[PDB]
DNA sequence: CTCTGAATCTCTTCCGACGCGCCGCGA
RNA sequence: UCCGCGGCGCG
DNA sequence: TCGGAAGAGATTCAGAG
């Protein structure tokens, strides 16, 4: 998974309970940046939350 | 005063344009009312059969 | 998702005679319910019907 | 789904999700024993959410999405011109249809429209599959499809075979009155323009400055029997709004007939006697007499007797060569006097009407087609054209306008002396200008309308 | 005198009126407004500096720290314009702002700074207008339409009793700010005064008046006029102005000077007023009934008890009067109610008000504005104050201030953008005066009242939105944390700014997609004015009155060019000379009148001033002294035409054509035809398509030169010189010695846009029109563009036209065309289509571009390379593969019995399927370009690597050729400097060029020049190498593309399209026509010399449409080619050039008093020969719009041409060989092809896809859907008895998911059965109604 | 002098053609 | 294989 | 996660008691 978001903020691993899958997200000041990236079958894909 | 064969001056032409745009707007608006009225009449009279 | 707005267990399978779990795949079991899940072996048309 | 793996969610799904979320929240606040005002707020939000789900925008501010647009609730799916009732239950889109730019075709009979070959192939592709397998040229649907997509000329022969009696419907949006949809028996032409018969084009309210038209093919045999018996243009001669015929010529046809029947005081071969209209046609075509020349001709006419027989009469009458030529096409039973005058549009209208009342439908149809052909041909031979010298300006006009402006100056100076109120001054000026304009119009009509020539 | 270039094809003008002012640069509004937006400004008046200063600085109180703004600068755009268009990235430059952060000490004074930090913030990216006035957004051209909206200020308006319908008249005055809440004041059928805020509610006006810090008695004293009464015992006195008596009926005797005189029951008249005024009466004695019925003006106090018995707005109770008179307050104050002049309206409002005090009114206003919450004094006060008087929440811009003052007649012109108490009370007083009838309501449709807002204002508004969002973020950051250990670079987030600006340029209703059919269309679309958009108007709510022409449109907005249909009136075009005043009001030029002599000075006017003065009509004849010939010169003034003496005239129109836009101005003989047809022709002219080969129009209007040069398509000579080199694509010009700057190479190069997709799929091509060694002049046109020839607009083509009905093939506007036209490719056009292939890293395996396609013949693949891309230059046809792409299908598991069934079947049921791009059905053409874009980290295939190699080679050769040309220029300048003296020409000639540059011929300034150019050479080689390195990295670098796509491929397909029956063609006067027949050339009518006609038009349309002018055009055409024919023959016989020279001089002299006055005696004979060569194809004629050729001049030209004077000729019918008895009008006409080709519309669907929800067939040509059997057609069927076809239309053909299958089966089987099921849309409706909670169900199953 | 009904006033809701064609954009 | 929203465009 | 017409409700005026 992509290790840093487009701003260069560091990324953490989260569970999407609405779709039962792992995703990666970034935070700044502990708050969510509103960015996420998801696994879509061998191709991590990224955008706004 | 001038007919179409002779040239119309700019003033005559300009004042004449009033009627032209009046008529074009007139038909543009009239179409909608006519269609609406027809839809109504059809809806009222659609049951009637000999 | 189960119990979701598109939960196949309720509305039926997304595909003709195809169990969400993949238990059954053809009409030989047409009109039966999968044990691992409550989806039914039926046609996709039921998706249009069930409320 | 969308490009990039995204998904467009229907707004109904979002409203449902919001209501589900509020219900879950209320149930959680209830089951964990929340304070009173909190659960009251949650249930009021839930009620508002249900209101949004059913009829968002019905009360207060409407809910909106990221696009700053109000979301379409269930009620919006049935209300309005985009609603389900008007859009789909009525006014369905339909298979087996095409649209094309229309075009004049004068060589068509009344009941046949010119239909581009490509559209015919596409529309009747199922029928072609059927007949091609029936005649044994193709065995399977795949074979039929690959054969028709290669346009093996045998497919063209089959296509010419299939449509021979197969009426199609032509429609022009908007379909203001029922004439707007009519049935025709197709004829195959290369190109891409649908060709109409001008006479029915007049009824369509259509023109040829780029109007498109849509064509539908009936499927079942009861349907095509209906199209033939009810809708075929040979039946819709009489408008429903009034008894007068709707199939009436205009433009070049009327101009041609008018030219053909107009006489002049002196022309090539005036006064000779023709033993029959055929000799009139000969003398015109051989160029020894002009159409306008007045002549005596022997003519036979007929009348529907008291029993119903077409009793004949023959006599010498004074007429014009053009009038005899036109008479030659007239079917038996109409009196010659109908023709022997300068034929305008209204005269032709009443002529068609009297033909339809005196005789049956089919003689009237044939009469209409012959009228169209002859009118076009003689209009073309006429060579009528408009030139700058034609719009003569009556030389009286300058004098009349000078008189009018003199009177305008007189009334204006009369007001300058304070003898009248301004409103009546305006009225007087308007009246005198109107009088002068009418005088000029009369002078122009008088100068244009008649002219002097040697006898 | 004419430039040498213009000596080619000197068009013959016919205008008699001189021209005193050249047409301005046509695009000036767009370019100048954008420049005003972006350019630097020290005063901070407009643009970036104004926007920043309107928000900055930013201060934090608890933080005790400040953010402040130094300056802004705009960075370099990294990509050129054509690179942006190729790669699809918005043409933008980085916004750089210099920012400072300040921290003070924690001790007084707060202004004691302690630390300063400064840095430059990359706060956003901003689009740049291209030189042609269009923006580049993503990969698209977009041009922002300048809006026209209601100006801020105050207006006064009345309805003719329509609302209440009893016959009275109601009035309202409205105040509109630039931004913020809108107030309007209104009367009532009960004559009460009401105020409303953003049209929320309706409230008595006193609410605001006491909300403003004024008490009731102050309100009465301010609004009304007061009269004084005295009581002594029971005798009553009043203090009077005699004029105050006027209006009343003297029902009682009235005393003056100790004598009483009144004719009782009679109204006081002017004789009475004069009698009292000469009496000089001051105080009179009146009966009790007279003071009865008078309002109590103020509170009154009784001192014997300390009690009040009089209130505000109360009637005179005689009991109270006695009580106050006995108390001692013998003086009484009352208002006056003239039934006409002094309506008691404010008093009635004061009676009906619910509020009693300032805070009561404040809380009532608050609860009105903020329903559903408890009022509070602070909340109401803050709401009111911030609403009207917070200069950031509400602002009348300076234009608002100007209009506000000038409508209120106040002397001031400037003021604070916020309202005030005096402003409100003044506007209310003005409304009262209007209600009295001593004034007039305002006319908003008037053009001195609406304002043009260009792109700059909208851009700065969006940028201000960005600035305020950033300001909120910055103040939040200041509040939340420390101030020392951070840099404002992080504090400012560029995201809101870029979001706002990109949203504006992409989304906004006024950012409409550009059209590029032809240069005229691009010009008129750039110049177009729209009344819609943000703060504008809606097509549904637009009444007639805004659409209709307003008499101040003259000279400012062209009345003709408006679009047809529902948009009419709401869209307009600038008149040719109109330019924007700095306040956004339209402005028109005029010529100063000075005592009967036109000064030829130019003054610019706005609708107000123009209405104030008297302006003379353009066509007024003048002497050479400037005196009009006629004394009673016709003029217009105050919106009316009349006659005036020579001295009364104040101004004169500049030129005849100033009433029309360019689009109308192109039409010749406009003065001879109706307005409807002229409008349609003007609009249609935009749709013309550029032909394969351009042609001049014979009967032009002179405007073609200005339009062709001003548009961006043509390459114009920016620097004079001599053309050194030309090929199909490059132009190299040697600048002359004097024009070149010191240190420059003296050579300029131009590269032509050879072929590219236009924004409407037409071709765009530039063709050179010069030859080696020809001199070129500043502003000359070197290379033609689409529909341009020799720098003149070339939309259409010249056709030979006869007006004659022909066998019905021209029935009802139909056009019949001779095959000769087709054979010469006269109207053949070139079209480009662009197709995109997207390769994705989809789930269940990636999808790849490849030539390994399953289930396909190898012959098709041979057209492709092994990579899976078609070679350029290959012909391709409908249904063929252009690029091969393949999608995996997932597992596709087969049971072993199905495995063996597949095995006996063959290779079917593959887990891998074709997805390759295919030619659109019916399209065929040739493949001209192929492009690939791919994500980083992926390998470049054979096609990708080969195209990258060719592109880098192209870049290298281009840069090196530029080097060679410019270094040749530099060394030519070396030669030019060295030959000047101290020459060593042969001694240098033995030496190589490097020696020339190195060696010193002298020791003087010449050697300084040589050293300068040598350093220039070093600098240019270094910049060349840097440029090539950047270019190579820029080519080799990958692309971002989109999510999920690995690589995209775009292929370019070009097709040649041909005139065909069903195509639509039209002439400039607006006579559309569908071509309905092609004819073998033999069959067309032919004239006496045997040359056939080309196009046959129906004459019947002319009198009924009243397009008389077009007939005149035809005649001129027959004249024009006439001369051409003669001169052609005179050339073909190869006679002495002097004879044709004198003939040409005669042809130019032929006009009477024409301004042209061109003479050939100054032309050398080879120039005359070149002129003849261009004139061989006819002599182009120039006819201005309203001063055009007269019939006498047309006749004279024809007579010199040896054609029939009437313009009609005898004609023979080719099909029979006989002669038409009537003469026929045959001439030359200019015709266009209208981009509605038949093959783009013909469409048919037997069966295909079906929609998801409704199961109905798809809609539209692209989806290959079917037509819509609309409800009108259903009623049509119902009118017949045709039930069965209706049932078939609804159920089986459309919606029955099984019935149509059965029908297809039976039709294939040859049995025309039918089985109607149930329309699935009905089940959809049932399910939705049930889901609504309403139970609905069928019965009697 | 008070009460009820009718009339008038205020507020809210509904409507304001059919058909095709391209372009853009889509938290 | 697709719900549109905005925009021009022709009837 | 914009004006117009019609209907319903509220308020005011006149007549009768
Ligand atoms: Mg039409
Ligand atoms: Zn299961």
UniProtKB/Swiss-Prot annotation, chain A:
Oligomer and partners: Monomer.
User: What does the UniProt function comment say about this protein?
Assistant: Releases the supercoiling and torsional tension of DNA, which is introduced during the DNA replication and transcription, by transiently cleaving and rejoining one strand of the DNA duplex. Introduces a single-strand break via transesterification at a target site in duplex DNA. The scissile phosphodiester is attacked by the catalytic tyrosine of the enzyme, resulting in the formation of a DNA-(5'-phosphotyrosyl)-enzyme intermediate and the expulsion of a 3'-OH DNA strand. The free DNA strand then undergoes passage around the unbroken strand, thus removing DNA supercoils.
Instruction: From the UniProt annotation, give the residues forming the signal peptide.
Output: none
Which lineage ranks, top first, belong to the organism behind this chain?
Answer: Bacteria, Pseudomonadati, Pseudomonadota, Gammaproteobacteria, Enterobacterales
Q: Which family does it belong to?
A: Belongs to the type IA topoisomerase family.
**Which stretch of the full-length chain is present here?**
817 to 865 of 865
- What biotechnological or industrial uses does this protein have? Has been used to construct a 2,4,6-trinitrotoluene (TNT) biosensor strain.
* This protein's encoding gene: topA
Give the induction text.
Answer: Transcription is increased specifically in response to 2,4,6-trinitrotoluene (TNT) and its indicator compounds 1,3-DNB, 2,4-DNT, and 2,6-DNT.
The protein depicted here goes by the name DNA topoisomerase 1
UniProtKB/Swiss-Prot annotation, chain B:
User: Which protein family is named in the record?
Assistant: Belongs to the RNA polymerase beta' chain family.
Taxonomic placement: Bacteria, Pseudomonadati, Pseudomonadota, Gammaproteobacteria, Enterobacterales
Report the biotech usage. Co-administration of salinamide and rifampicin or salinamide and myxopyronin suppresses the emergence of resistance to both antibiotics.
* Source organism of the structure: Escherichia coli (strain K12)
Recorded superkingdom = Bacteria
The record's note on quaternary structure and interaction partners says: The RNAP catalytic core consists of 2 alpha, 1 beta, 1 beta' and 1 omega subunit. When a sigma factor is associated with the core the holoenzyme is formed, which can initiate transcription. The rRNA transcription and antitermination complex (rrnTAC) consists of RNAP, NusA, NusB, NusE (rpsJ), NusG, SubB, ribosomal protein S4, DNA and precursor rRNA; S4 is more flexible than other subunits.
Describe what happens upon changing residue 24 to R. Resistant to antibiotics salinamide A and B
Effect in UniProt of substituting residue 16 to A:
Resistant to antibiotics salinamide A and B
Q: How is it modified after translation?
A: Acetylated on several lysine residues in the presence of glucose.
Q: What is the stated purpose of this protein?
A: DNA-dependent RNA polymerase (RNAP) catalyzes the transcription of DNA into RNA using the four ribonucleoside triphosphates as substrates. Resistance to the antibiotics salinamide A, salinamide B, rifampicin, streptolydigin, CBR703, myxopyronin, and lipiarmycin can result from mutations in this protein.
Name of the featured protein:
DNA-directed RNA polymerase subunit beta'
Q: What is the effect of changing residue 4 to C?
A: Resistant to antibiotics salinamide A and B
UniProtKB/Swiss-Prot annotation, chain D:
Record-annotated residues binding Mg(2+)? Answer: 207, 209, 211
The UniProt-reported impact of residue 437 to D is: Resistant to antibiotics salinamide A and B
Uses, biotech or industry: Co-administration of salinamide and rifampicin or salinamide and myxopyronin suppresses the emergence of resistance to both antibiotics.
The record's account of how the chain is modified after translation: Acetylated on several lysine residues in the presence of glucose.
The listed outcome for residue 251 to P is: Resistant to antibiotics salinamide A and B
The subunit structure is: The RNAP catalytic core consists of 2 alpha, 1 beta, 1 beta' and 1 omega subunit. When a sigma factor is associated with the core the holoenzyme is formed, which can initiate transcription. The rRNA transcription and antitermination complex (rrnTAC) consists of RNAP, NusA, NusB, NusE (rpsJ), NusG, SubB, ribosomal protein S4, DNA and precursor rRNA; S4 is more flexible than other subunits.
Job of this protein: DNA-dependent RNA polymerase (RNAP) catalyzes the transcription of DNA into RNA using the four ribonucleoside triphosphates as substrates.
Family per record = Belongs to the RNA polymerase beta' chain family.
| Protein name per the record | DNA-directed RNA polymerase subunit beta'
Q: Give the source species.
A: Escherichia coli (strain K12)
Higher taxonomy: Bacteria, Pseudomonadati, Pseudomonadota, Gammaproteobacteria, Enterobacterales
From Swiss-Prot, chain E:
**Biotechnological relevance of this protein:** Co-administration of salinamide and rifampicin or salinamide and myxopyronin suppresses the emergence of resistance to both antibiotics.
Question: PROSITE patterns this protein is in?
Answer: RNA_POL_BETA
Report whether Transferase shows up as a keyword of the record: yes
InterPro entries in the record, alphabetically?
Answer: DNA-dir_RNA_pol_bsu_ext_1_sf (IPR042107), DNA-dir_RNA_pol_bsu_external_1 (IPR019462), DNA-dir_RNA_pol_su2 (IPR015712), DNA-dir_RNAP_su2_dom (IPR007120), DNA-dir_RNAP_su2_hyb_sf (IPR037033), RNA_pol_bsu_bac (IPR010243), RNA_pol_bsu_CS (IPR007121), RNA_pol_bsu_protrusion (IPR007644)
Q: According to the UniProt entry, what is the EC number of this protein?
A: 2.7.7.6
This entry's Gene Ontology molecular function terms read: DNA binding; DNA-directed RNA polymerase activity; ribonucleoside binding
Similarity annotation: Belongs to the RNA polymerase beta chain family.
Q: Which HAMAP family match?
A: RNApol_bact_RpoB (MF_01321)
Which protein is depicted?
DNA-directed RNA polymerase subunit beta
Higher taxonomy? Bacteria, Pseudomonadati, Pseudomonadota, Gammaproteobacteria, Enterobacterales
Gene this chain is encoded by:
rpoB
């Amino acid at each position: 998974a992509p290790q840093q978001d487009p701003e260069g903020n560091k990324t953490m691993v989260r569970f999407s309970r609405k779709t039962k899958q792992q995703y990666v997200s970034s935070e700044k000041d502990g708050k969510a940046t509103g960015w996420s990236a998801f696994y879509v079958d061998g191709k991590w894909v990224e955008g706004k939350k | 005063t001038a007919n179409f064969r002779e040239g119309l001056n700019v003033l005559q032409y300009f004042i004449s344009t009033h009627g032209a745009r009046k008529g074009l707007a007139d038909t543009a608006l009239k179409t909608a009312n006519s269609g609406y009225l027809t839809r109504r009449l059809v809806d009222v009279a659609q049951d009637l059969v000999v | 998702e189960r119990d979701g707005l598109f939960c196949a267990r309720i509305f039926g399978p997304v595909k003709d005679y195809e169990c969400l779990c993949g238990k059954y795949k053809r009409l030989k079991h047409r009109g039966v319910i999968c044990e691992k899940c409550g989806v039914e072996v039926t046609q996709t048309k039921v998706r249009r019907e069930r409320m | 789904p969308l490009d990039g793996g995204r998904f467009a969610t229907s707004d109904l799904n979002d409203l449902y999700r919001r209501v589900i979320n509020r219900n879950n929240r209320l149930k959680r606040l209830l089951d964990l024993a929340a304070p009173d005002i909190i659960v009251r707020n949650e249930k009021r939000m839930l009620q508002e959410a249900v209101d949004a789900l059913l009829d968002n925008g019905r009360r207060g501010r409407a809910i909106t999405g990221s696009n700053k647009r109000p979301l379409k609730s269930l009620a919006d799916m049935i209300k309005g011109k985009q609603g389900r009732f008007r859009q789909n239950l009525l006014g369905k889109r339909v298979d087996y249809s095409g649209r094309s730019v229309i075009t004049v075709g004068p060589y068509l009979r009344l009941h046949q429209c010119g239909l581009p070959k490509k559209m015919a192939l596409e529309l009747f592709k199922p029928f072609i599959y059927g007949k091609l397998e029936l005649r044994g040229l193709a065995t399977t649907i795949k074979a039929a499809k690959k054969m028709v997509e290669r346009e093996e000329a045998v497919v063209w022969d089959i296509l010419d075979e299939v449509i021979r009696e197969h009426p199609v419907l032509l429609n022009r949006a908007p379909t203001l009155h029922r004439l707007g949809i009519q049935a025709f028996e197709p004829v195959l032409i290369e190109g891409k323009a649908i060709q109409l018969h001008p006479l029915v084009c007049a009824a369509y309210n259509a023109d040829f400055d780029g109007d498109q038209m849509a064509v539908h093919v009936p499927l079942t045999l009861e349907a095509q029997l209906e199209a033939r018996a009810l809708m075929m243009s040979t039946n819709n001669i009489l408008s429903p709004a009034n008894g007068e015929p709707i199939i009436v010529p205009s433009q070049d046809v009327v101009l041609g007939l008018y030219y053909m029947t107009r006489d002049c005081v002196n022309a090539k071969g005036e006064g000779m006697v023709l033993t029959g209209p055929k000799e009139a046609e000969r003398l015109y075509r051989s160029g020894l007499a002009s159409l306008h020349a007045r002549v005596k001709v022997r003519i036979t006419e007929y009348e529907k007797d008291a029993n119903g027989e077409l009793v004949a009469k023959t006599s010498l009458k004074d007429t014009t060569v053009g009038r005899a030529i036109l008479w030659m096409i007239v079917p038996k039973g109409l009196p010659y006097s109908i023709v022997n005058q300068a034929l305008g549009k209204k005269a032709i209208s009443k002529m068609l009407n009297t033909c339809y009342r005196i005789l049956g439908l089919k003689p009237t149809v044939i009469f209409a087609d012959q009228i169209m052909y002859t009118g076009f041909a003689y209009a073309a031979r006429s060579g009528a054209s408009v030139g700058i010298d034609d719009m003569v300006i009556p030389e009286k006009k300058h004098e009349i306008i000078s008189e009018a402006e003199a009177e305008v100056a007189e009334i204006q100076e009369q007001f300058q002396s304070g003898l009248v109120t301004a409103g009546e001054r305006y009225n007087k000026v308007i009246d005198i200008w109107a009088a002068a304009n009418d005088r000029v119009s009369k002078a122009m009509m008088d100068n244009l309308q008649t002219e002097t020539v040697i006898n | 005198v004419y430039s040498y270039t213009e000596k080619k094809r000197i068009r013959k003008d016919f205008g008699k009126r001189p021209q005193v002012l050249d047409v301005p640069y046509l695009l000036s509004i767009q370019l100048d407004s954008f420049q005003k937006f972006i350019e630097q400004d020290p005063e901070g008046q407009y643009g970036l500096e104004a926007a920043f200063r309107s928000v900055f600085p930013i201060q934090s109180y608890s933080g005790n720290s400040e953010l402040q703004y130094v300056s802004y600068r705009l960075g370099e755009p990294v990509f050129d314009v054509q690179e942006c268009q190729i790669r699809g990235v918005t043409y933008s430059a980085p916004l750089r702002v210099k920012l400072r952060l300040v921290i003070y000490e924690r001790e007084a004074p707060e202004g004691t700074v302690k630390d300063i930090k400064e840095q430059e913030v990359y706060m956003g990216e901003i689009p740049l207008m291209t030189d042609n006035g269009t923006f580049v957004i993503n990969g698209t051209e977009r041009v922002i339409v300048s809006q026209l909206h209601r100006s801020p200020g105050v207006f006064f308006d009345s309805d003719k009793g329509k609302t209440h319908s009893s016959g009275k008249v109601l009035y309202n005055a409205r105040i509109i700010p630039y931004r913020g809440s809108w107030l309007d004041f209104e009367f009532d059928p009960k004559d009460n005064l009401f105020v409303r805020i953003d049209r929320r509610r309706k409230l008595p006006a006193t609410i605001i008046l006491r909300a403003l810090n004024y008490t009731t008695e102050q309100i009465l004293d301010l609004f009304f006029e007061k009269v004084i009464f005295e009581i002594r015992d029971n005798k009553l006195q009043m203090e009077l102005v005699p004029e105050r008596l006027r209006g009343e009926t003297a029902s009682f005797d009235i005393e003056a000077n100790g004598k009483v005189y009144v004719e009782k029951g009679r109204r006081i008249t002017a004789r009475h007023i004069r009698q009292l005024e000469k009496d000089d009466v001051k105080l009179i004695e009146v009966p009790v009934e007279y003071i009865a019925g008078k309002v109590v003006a103020k509170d009154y106090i009784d001192e014997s008890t300390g009690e009040l018995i009089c209130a505000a707005n109360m009637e005179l109770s005689l009991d109270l009067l006695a009580k106050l008179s006995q108390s001692g307050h013998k003086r009484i104050e009352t208002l006056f109610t003239n039934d006409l002049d002094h309506g008691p309206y404010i008093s009635e409002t004061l009676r009906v008000d619910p509020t009693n005090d300032r805070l009561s009114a404040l809380v009532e206003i608050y609860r009105m504005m903020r329903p559903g919450e408890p009022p509070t004094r602070e909340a109401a006060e803050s709401l009111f104050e911030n609403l009207f008087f917070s200069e950031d929440r509400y602002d009348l811009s300076a234009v608002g201030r100007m209009k506000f003052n000038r409508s209120l007649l106040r002397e001031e012109i400037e003021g604070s953008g916020i309202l005030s108490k005096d402003d409100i009370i003044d506007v209310m007083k003005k409304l009262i005066d209007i209600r009295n009838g001593k004034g007039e309501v305002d006319d908003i449709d008037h053009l001195g009242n609406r304002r043009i807002r260009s792109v700059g204002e909208m851009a700065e508004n969006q940028f201000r939105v960005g600035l305020v969002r950033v300001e909120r973020a910055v103040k939040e950051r200041l509040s939340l944390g420390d101030l020392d250990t951070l840099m404002p670079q992080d504090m400012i987030n560029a995201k809101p700014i870029s979001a706002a600006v990109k949203e504006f340029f992409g989304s906004s209703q006024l950012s409409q997609f550009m059209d590029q059919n032809n240069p005229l269309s691009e010009i008129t679309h750039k110049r177009r004015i729209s009344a819609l958009g943000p703060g504008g108007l809606t097509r549904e709510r637009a009444g007639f009155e805004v659409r209709d022409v307003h008499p101040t449109h003259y000279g400012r907005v062209c009345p003709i060019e408006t679009p047809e249909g529902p948009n009419i009136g709401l869209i307009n075009s600038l008149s040719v000379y109109a330019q924007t005043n700095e306040y956004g009001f339209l402005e028109t030029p005029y010529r100063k009148v000075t005592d009967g002599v036109v000064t030829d000075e130019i003054h610019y006017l706005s609708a107000i001033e123009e209405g104030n003065y008297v302006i003379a009509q353009a066509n007024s004849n003048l002497d050479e002294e400037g005196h009009f010939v006629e004394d009673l010169v016709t003029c217009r003034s105050k919106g009316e035409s009349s006659l005036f003496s020579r001295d009364q005239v104040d101004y004169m129109d500049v030129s005849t054509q100033q009433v029309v836009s360019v689009g109308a101005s192109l039409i010749p003989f406009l003065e001879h035809d109706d307005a409807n047809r002229a409008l349609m022709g003007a609009n249609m002219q935009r749709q013309a398509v550029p032909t394969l080969r351009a042609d001049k129009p014979l009967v032009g209007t002179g405007m073609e030169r200005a339009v062709a040069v001003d548009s961006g398509v043509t390459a114009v000579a920016k620097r004079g010189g001599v053309v050194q080199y030309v090929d199909a694509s490059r132009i190299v010009i040697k600048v002359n010695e004097d024009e070149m700057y010191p240190g420059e190479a003296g050579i300029d190069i131009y590269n032509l846009t050879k072929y590219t997709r236009s924004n409407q799929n037409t071709c765009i091509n530039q063709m050179p029109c010069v030859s080696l060694g020809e001199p070129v002049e500043r502003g000359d046109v070197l290379a033609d563009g689409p529909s341009t020839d020799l720098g003149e607009l070339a939309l259409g083509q010249n056709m030979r036209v006869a007006f004659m009905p022909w066998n019905g093939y021209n029935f009802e506007d139909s056009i019949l065309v001779s095959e000769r036209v087709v054979q010469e490719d006269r109207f053949t056009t070139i079209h480009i289509q662009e197709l995109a292939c997207v390769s994705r890293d989809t789930k269940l395996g990636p999808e790849e571009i490849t030539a390994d396609i399953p289930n396909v013949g190898e012959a098709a693949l041979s057209k492709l390379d092994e990579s899976g891309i078609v070679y350029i230059g290959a012909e391709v046809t409908g249904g063929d593969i252009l690029v091969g792409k393949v999608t995996p299908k997932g597992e596709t598991q087969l049971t072993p019995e199905e495995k063996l069934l597949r095995a006996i079947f063959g290779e079917k049921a593959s887990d891998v399927k074709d997805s390759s791009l295919r030619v659109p059905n019916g399209v065929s053409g040739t493949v001209i370009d192929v492009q690939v874009f791919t994500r980083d980290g992926v390998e470049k295939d054979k096609r990708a690597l080969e195209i990258e190699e060719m592109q880098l080679k192209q870049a290298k050769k281009d840069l090196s050729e530029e080097l060679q040309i410019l270094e040749a220029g530099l060394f030519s300048r070396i030669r030019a400097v060295l030959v000047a003296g101290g020459v060593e020409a042969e001694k240098l000639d033995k030496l190589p060029r490097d020696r020339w540059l190195e060696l010193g011929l002298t020791d003087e300034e010449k050697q300084n020049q040589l050293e300068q150019l040598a350093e220039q050479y070093d600098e240019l080689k270094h910049e060349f190498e840097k440029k090539l390195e950047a270019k190579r990295r820029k080519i080799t670098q990958g692309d971002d593309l989109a999510p999920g796509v690995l690589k995209i491929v775009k292929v370019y397909l070009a097709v040649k399209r041909r005139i065909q029956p069903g195509d639509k063609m039209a002439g400039r006067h607006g006579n559309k026509g569908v071509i309905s027949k092609i004819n073998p050339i033999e069959d067309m009518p032919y004239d006496e010399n045997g040359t056939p006609v080309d196009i046959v038009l129906n004459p019947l349309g002319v009198p009924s449409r009243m397009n008389i002018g077009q007939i005149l055009e035809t005649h001129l055409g027959m004249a024009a080619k006439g001369i051409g024919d003669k001169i052609n023959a005179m050339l073909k016989q190869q006679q002495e050039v002097a004879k044709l020279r004198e003939f040409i001089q005669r042809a130019y002299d032929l006009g009477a008093d024409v301004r042209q006055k061109v003479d050939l005696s100054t032309f050398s004979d080879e120039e005359v020969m070149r002129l003849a060569e261009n004139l061989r194809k006819g002599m182009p004629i120039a006819t201005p719009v309203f001063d055009g050729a007269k019939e006498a001049e047309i006749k004279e030209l024809l007579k010199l041409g040896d054609l029939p004077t009437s313009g009609q000729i005898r004609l023979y019918d080719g099909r029979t060989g006989e002669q038409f008895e009537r003469p026929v009008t045959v001439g030359y006409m200019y015709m266009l092809k209208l981009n509605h080709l038949v093959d783009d519309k013909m469409h048919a669907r037997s069966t295909g896809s079906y929609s998801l929800v409704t199961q109905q067939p798809l809609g539209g040509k692209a989806q290959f859907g079917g037509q819509r059997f609309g409800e009108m057609e259903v009623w049509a069927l119902e009118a017949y008895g045709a039930a069965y076809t209706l049932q078939e239309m609804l159920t089986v053909k459309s919606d029955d998911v099984n019935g149509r299958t059965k029908m297809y089966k039976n039709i294939v089987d040859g049995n025309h059965q039918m089985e109607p099921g149930m329309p699935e849309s009905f089940n959809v409706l049932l399910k939705e109604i049930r889901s609504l909670g309403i139970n609905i169900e069928l019965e009697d199953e």
